[PDB]
Design a protein around this ligand. Structure first.
Ligand SMILES: [Cl-]
Ligand SMILES: [Cl-]
Length: 175
């Protein structure tokens, strides 16, 4: 009742993964694995967290954006106006030249824009962590977008929530 799943073991109905490299082909992926348009810049595989294939691993080898995206622009439910995007993430290879985590993006337009440097130390054990991202410090297209040139991580259990799980780490707003 607290939450709206976006990717909890499988994509919620109106959702896709989007793998967007520097090529002229953008890939909308709804299964266990995918490649970006150039077949190399951004790859998705399944990984196992709590069940077989409940996570997705993503490997960046060149400039590319991964999004978890709505099939059509969807206004943020007012239920979540002071809520959180929650997800589990494991960063197995930190980005040498950095990465951007954007949350709840419209056409022009993200609710949060977080550099990986801002939470890199808490992720540096290369273990899974539950991250709670407060949405506030118009129709939404990308629930999340991660952009980098070189990076390896995995994501699971992505949901909008009004209250962060107990063992969550809040990516609070920069001062
Ligand atoms: Cl990088
Ligand atoms: Cl960074």
């Amino acid at each position: 009742s607290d939450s709206h799943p976006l990717f909890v073991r499988s994509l919620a109905k109106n959702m896709t993964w989007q793998l967007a490299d520097t090529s002229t082909q953008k890939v909308l992926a709804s299964g266990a694995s995918a490649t970006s348009g150039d077949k190399q810049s951004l790859l998705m595989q399944s990984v196992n967290l709590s069940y077989q294939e409940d996570g997705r691993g993503f490997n960046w080898r060149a400039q590319a954006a991964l999004s978890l995206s709505y099939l059509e622009p969807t206004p943020l439910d007012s239920k979540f106006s002071t809520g959180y995007l929650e997800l589990k993430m494991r960063i197995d290879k930190a980005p040498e030249q950095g990465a951007n985590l954007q949350v709840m993006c419209s056409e022009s337009n993200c609710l949060r824009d977080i550099d990986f440097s801002s939470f890199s130390q808490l992720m540096a054990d290369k273990s899974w962590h539950t991250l709670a991202i407060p949405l506030h410090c118009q129709p939404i297209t990308d629930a999340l977008r991660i952009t980098s040139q070189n990076l390896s991580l995995a994501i699971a259990d992505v949901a909008l929530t009004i209250k962060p799980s107990d063992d969550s780490i809040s990516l609070t707003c920069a001062k």
